[PDB]
Amino acid sequence: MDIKINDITLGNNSPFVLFGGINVLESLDSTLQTCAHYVEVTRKLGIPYIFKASFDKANRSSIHSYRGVGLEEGLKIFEKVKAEFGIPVITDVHEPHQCQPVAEVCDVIQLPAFLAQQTDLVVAMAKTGNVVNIKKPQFLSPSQMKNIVEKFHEAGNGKLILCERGSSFGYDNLVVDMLGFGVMKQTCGNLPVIFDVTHSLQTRRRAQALDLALAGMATRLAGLFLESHLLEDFLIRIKALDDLIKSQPILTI
Amino acid sequence: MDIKINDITLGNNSPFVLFGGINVLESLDSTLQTCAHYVEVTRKLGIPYIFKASFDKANRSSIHSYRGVGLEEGLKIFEKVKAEFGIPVITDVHEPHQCQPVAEVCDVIQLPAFLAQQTDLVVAMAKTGNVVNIKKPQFLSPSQMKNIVEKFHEAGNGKLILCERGSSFGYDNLVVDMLGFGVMKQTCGNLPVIFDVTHSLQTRRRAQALDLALAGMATRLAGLFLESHPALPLHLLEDFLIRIKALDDLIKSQPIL
Amino acid sequence: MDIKINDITLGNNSPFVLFGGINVLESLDSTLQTCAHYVEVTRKLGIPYIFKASFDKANRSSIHSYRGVGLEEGLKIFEKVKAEFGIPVITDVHEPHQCQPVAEVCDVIQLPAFLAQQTDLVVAMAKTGNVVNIKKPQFLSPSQMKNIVEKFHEAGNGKLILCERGSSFGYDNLVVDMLGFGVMKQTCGNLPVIFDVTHSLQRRAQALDLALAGMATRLAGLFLESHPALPLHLLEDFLIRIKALDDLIKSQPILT
Amino acid sequence: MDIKINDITLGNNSPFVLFGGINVLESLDSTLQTCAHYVEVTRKLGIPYIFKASFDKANRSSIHSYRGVGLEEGLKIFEKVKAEFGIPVITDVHEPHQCQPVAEVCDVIQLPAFLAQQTDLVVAMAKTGNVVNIKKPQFLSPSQMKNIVEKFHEAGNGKLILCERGSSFGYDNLVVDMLGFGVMKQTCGNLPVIFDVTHSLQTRGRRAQALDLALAGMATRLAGLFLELHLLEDFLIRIKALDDLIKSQPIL
Ligand SMILES: [Cl-]
Ligand SMILES: [Cl-]
Ligand SMILES: [Cl-]
Ligand SMILES: [Cl-]
Ligand code: NA
């Protein structure tokens, strides 16, 4: 199942979409600068691109780390990003009451992994009718993603993206089960699956991120998700592999 | 470090405290019945007791599943429990806004394991000044507990309990690392460590719960956390606690080293 | 099911048996000194005791680190231990050819974890008719122990001990699943289950917490190593604590 | 570091080599037939190929299960394979005493995963001077492989291949850490690393799964792939495409 996000088609058989940006929104000027860089690189390579940032990050490393500019100013910034570059945007939400006003502006709303089972947030997100990115918790098996999908469906929204971020592997370390992508596709109706390489790696380097991104994209994925000419060299390699993989028909039976 | 909860002393070298009750509050009458049984049994065995229940099941499999009585009715039930039995109570909170009204009634407020990283909820809980039970996520190592403790300390609340519930082990399975208890004691300032045997078995029986509870308490813990239904069958509670008390008494009588 | 090892009764509802000794037999006099200390401490506390050592360490840190004294001299040392102290002994075997000559002298023979699926060794060990200790591989689940047991049974030997050594937990880390003891008892006919606390680790407070936790589940024995690994002089204090817990547990009927 | 195996160049920046064949040798005729198929498919795709089989099944579900043909008869069969097809072969050894006679015939000798820390078998294998394939145990981390490599080096053999077969993941399951390949390259002197996809899937062996997993591993730039209506060819076509692309990009 493909999802149209403005003029982008997101799907496990479509050219990969890059989701990237900055961790937390700080100011209009700084956001536009970082976004302009992603936009310039992705436009040069012909890669569809969706700008990501948090306006109110609830799982910060310290209680006083900056949460972001907050909802009202954050949405103003996202409007400006959309107006300037004509690209879609994605942001996370953590309170039910935020979902509607965020969804007025942000094309894709994201369900944090730690909130993935919180029924009230699932419902409030579903009811926006917007495209939703579901971050897969590290302790959930790929066959359990269907239960989250089922709750969104009950609440009336099927425009769901499944975002891999690795799996708990003993203490601290995460490992990405390359077989999990296929399991999610088979059990969740072939919804777009994207790969958050960055999270998957923070518990373990450019060479690593490249190996791990390439390995995942070799399984045929709708997109690559990054958390905060290097970007260019990286994306050239990902695009090479993605173009190859996507040009070949799915093996048939 | 010990924590006083009314007349209870909770600590890793004190007689174990039972945190027991039910999954979710369903009615006043059922709650009082179950509680009365836990109270009668614990009083005769001389085990300090704190009644546990959730007022809301926030993460059920279906949007349409029964969720429990809710905050306003739930707090009314907890008030009645406290008035009738004179014991402390514990419940979980899932939204920052709930922390203050819950804390007015409930002696211990609990941070759900799935929410342990939710910084706004930590801060809201800390600011109540109540005793807090931190459920250790299945995906977090015992040496990472200190980062959660640090957050509560930076927010001004040091009355913290660390609650083991097992660790992720492959897909859809949990294992309890009996060494993790000592790691949490050594890295988190010897705050009280308790063991949720019920949720540690989620992915696996009476015999199993006893073996696991005995093993954990053998490491010298402040408390045991469990659920029953009329989860262990409620009528087996007394026999189960006799065994746990026997072991706890023995362990706590031996000097540390 | 209990197993008689000379005058010792080994079983999940019997007083625990200590299996202890050293890593590798390196010399006679030092072996006897160490054994003497285990004997004195276990005799004082009334704990049945089986002396453990390897004569041929097949998995060494370096290719030329000393393997140990080898079969012929190792068995002579075991005979001397048996003659001097009148206790049983346990050692591991790595090759089918070693099973007979080791079984003639040693009261328990041990199947190394890394060799647990090697059918020729299983058969050769089974055919000795000796008591066998099966070391559970860190990658095998407790419900897969029955398959090793089955192979010993097919080969005609039911005098089997199952020995927990922990489970692989991510990289380089082991966890002991306290529920695995019960799974092994329920699936393998209540054969004696013993706990190798030493190999389950990789320090004193940790070994004690882990040993107590395990023994709380009701086990036939505890398996450990010391160095002249727990320090040998703290042995008494350690065993006092284990015995206290074992005595309490075993004095209570199984919850039925 | 590359390894020459007759006319094959095995290395992490060389075209991938397929190591493939069968579980256990059962008879001369069925071996030749299977080998002929691998040869025909690999030759037409232009993929270097090494034939794999065991002469003995050392871990049998039953004491009375069939064990395979054994050393003497097995080595006869391997000699016939080499003579008929002019390819190298690989087999595993389980006892020190077997290493020299096996090594006279078999181009690559393999250290079984369960025996990787058996020092006497390491030494005996090293002393053959043959190319050795070291199967990484499911319970050993990638950073520990350097200790095995060190032993073989001390014993005088540097012609080592490191073979990934997955890592223990809870009970009765495996997962393959795609970052482990890089760890092994970086810590073991860039020795050839190959991927045993077959054994990595033991606990899951669907065709779509094997392909996804093989493609993912080969995306990390490996020396080879190890495995046991025209499934092999369809699979190899896709693997070769990806390998050619990855190998054509310069290392960063
Ligand atoms: Cl997570
Ligand atoms: Cl709970
Ligand atoms: Cl959890
Ligand atoms: Cl092992
Ligand atoms: Na004997």
From Swiss-Prot, chain B:
It catalyses: D-arabinose 5-phosphate + phosphoenolpyruvate + H2O = 3-deoxy-alpha-D-manno-2-octulosonate-8-phosphate + phosphate. Disulfide bonds: none annotated. Its main location: cytoplasm. Coiled coil: none annotated. Pathway: Carbohydrate biosynthesis; 3-deoxy-D-manno-octulosonate biosynthesis; 3-deoxy-D-manno-octulosonate from D-ribulose 5-phosphate: step 2/3; Bacterial outer membrane biogenesis; lipopolysaccharide biosynthesis. One of its GO terms (molecular function) is 3-deoxy-8-phosphooctulonate synthase activity. Keywords: Cytoplasm, Lipopolysaccharide biosynthesis, Transferase. GO terms for cellular component: cytosol. PANTHER family: PHOSPHO-2-DEHYDRO-3-DEOXYHEPTONATE ALDOLASE (PTHR21057). This is 2-dehydro-3-deoxyphosphooctonate aldolase. It comes from Neisseria meningitidis serogroup B (strain ATCC BAA-335 / MC58). The lineage of its organism: Bacteria, Pseudomonadati, Pseudomonadota, Betaproteobacteria, Neisseriales. The gene is kdsA.
Swiss-Prot record, chain D:
One of its GO terms (molecular function) is 3-deoxy-8-phosphooctulonate synthase activity. Its EC number is 2.5.1.55. It catalyses: D-arabinose 5-phosphate + phosphoenolpyruvate + H2O = 3-deoxy-alpha-D-manno-2-octulosonate-8-phosphate + phosphate. The keyword rRNA processing does not apply. This is 2-dehydro-3-deoxyphosphooctonate aldolase. It is found in: Cytoplasm. GO terms for cellular component: cytosol. Keywords: Cytoplasm, Lipopolysaccharide biosynthesis, Transferase. Belongs to the KdsA family. InterPro entries: Aldolase_TIM, DAHP1/KDSA, KDO8P_synthase. The keyword Transferase applies. Pathway: Carbohydrate biosynthesis; 3-deoxy-D-manno-octulosonate biosynthesis; 3-deoxy-D-manno-octulosonate from D-ribulose 5-phosphate: step 2/3; Bacterial outer membrane biogenesis; lipopolysaccharide biosynthesis. Pfam families: DAHP_synth_1 (PF00793). GO terms for biological process: keto-3-deoxy-D-manno-octulosonic acid biosynthetic process.
